[model samples]
Target: PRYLKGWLEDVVQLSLRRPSVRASRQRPIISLNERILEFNKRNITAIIAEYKRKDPSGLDVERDPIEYAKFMERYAVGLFISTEEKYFNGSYETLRKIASSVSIPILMYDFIVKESQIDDAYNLGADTVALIVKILTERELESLLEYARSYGMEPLIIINDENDLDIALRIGARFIGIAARDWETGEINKENQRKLISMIPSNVVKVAKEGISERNEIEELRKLGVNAFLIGSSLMRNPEKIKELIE
Candidate 1:
């Protein structure tokens, strides 16, 4: 499904004006590439902690986004903030505030359907953005990746299964995210996670997202050479767990 027409228009306006307006609120673009290099040096799984308004599973957690950002920064090497207002109850304001407040890099995690979203992400101080191959056409995906790079924002190509993985490889994606949850079924499957990780190229930075609940799971994925793990709910519930999970 396409984004609302009004939302699309707003995004376009912001994108067109971003280059001039962005200087007023300058935010450093933390290099995900450099961080991955560090991860390899340490031989430790880099943690990308996701912050959201509420859990998708109907669990309501009342935590201020700014406060959450500060807490996560203490433990996570990077951050992932949802900006989708519908399901994730996310806000671009929150994304900007967190980015400005934290020294770590932030990933704009959303169902990015247009090029303007990529522009907005860059303008909002996002260091990277996630693109799911399941919902986007090949042309859309490639175009968004190109647009993100134009703004110096890293594009993370997300794959849910083998077909998506094949397409990502075919397109020569260097940064890849293997979703532990199946988008079609909305269920977590370890087997699928393992299967997809096995097929990923050694040179690509393999990041695991969703359905990861425990520290041991991160250890297991690390065994497969997965360099990073993005955890949301568990960390949101208690940010202190980040140290235990990653360290």
Candidate 2:
């Protein structure tokens, strides 16, 4: 759905007056050509390394980027570019470079309050970008996707509840990210995934995104018709630990 219009309008005002403010904010503003190069240079393994150092409790952390990609490729687990702290820490470009190096379809994850940000996502070479339903209405969502598709970009809508799922289905969404964590606090919502996934229709490609570890979890979700998964902390905290799973 379209983002809270007011939220983006504020960003537009700030950006028009001071472009650097947006850059410093680290919003997904990179263009298609920029994303192409970034894609060419991304390293998922190193991302895991950094995550291990920053938040050890979140993911396994031993493998390097190449190894991580290998595992994902072997296991058919899709990869995404999800970064949120780069503005504060000044490391956004580093992560972008790593994501660019891999062939896996990348989803540029951000709050995405503005239409300009969607333009930026396409320019940056994203196969998909995220939209949240908590902030937009069904009508807004449809308009946004229509606008995005017209520009030759695909949107991945995230659903953590029934309302969100309904919006997704209505919008004809093909890719979806399911989070077991609250967007504001990052608190893991264990049942968020369970409750949401139970209602998933068989046609759309459902992606399980949080608290994934151990082969059993992956297998279990696969059995539930979730063939695509995104593991951030699990891979980042211990990049090395994914080697066995890669094969």
Candidate 3:
């Protein structure tokens, strides 16, 4: 079999059954690194706003991907589309539609379990992909990280603590997402942003994820030297929330 077990074992694996393909047919339209450079050039922080219609926790945003992508892209450095169609109930069709419409970087934030998924990300019109440390082994994570770059799609290593950070850097992670919520536990801790920010050197792109809502918290994180943020449910609840977070 060409398929491999990652993040979960074989048999009854949703990733194994995904209707995804392999190999990108085109170069990444925009690089995530290129977008991050814009922040430094303009002296600003960026919100990589997410366009998630629904999540497993029952948080639903009754908005179309294209409309939300347009609105969010105006204020953000980029956008993230939850394209994992299982637990997140994401759609490749939504990713394709929005990517064609939006000019900014679109990250395919999903539980990437194989190299084939990277192909889906690139072919579907994404400039970046998210790889969480909690779900994947060191070999799988490292292999998948480098494989995305082959298609010109940047891979972001999402981590919970120093252990994850160590391996991520060793694997030459260009982008690291400090996850505020534990991937398995559903617990939110603000210290994950603060603690990891000081540990990560400024060279690596630091993207803070999950439970990011408050204006005060954004400023606090900014002080900690966070480069970007992934804002989702809060922005979904109030479409006008972007006006308040113009840092």
Instruction: Compute each candidate's TM-score over C-alphas.
Output: 0.87, 0.66, 0.89
lDDT tens per residue, model 1, 203-225:
88888877787888888888897
Judged by TM-score, which candidate is best? 3
The whole-model lDDT of each prediction reads 0.76, 0.54, 0.76
lDDT of 1 at 158: 92
* Model 2 RMSD in angstroms: 8.0
Q: Over the stretch 139-161, how does candidate 3's per-residue lDDT look in tens digits?
A: 88888978887777678798888
Whole-model alpha-carbon lDDT for candidate 3: 0.76
Candidate achieving higher TM-score, 1 or 2? 1
| Clash totals in order | 0, 35, 0
Off by over 4 Å in 2: 1-77, 83-92
Residue 196 C-alpha lDDT in model 1: 92
What is candidate 1's TM-score against the reference?
0.87
Question: Using alpha carbons, what is the TM-score of model 3?
Answer: 0.89
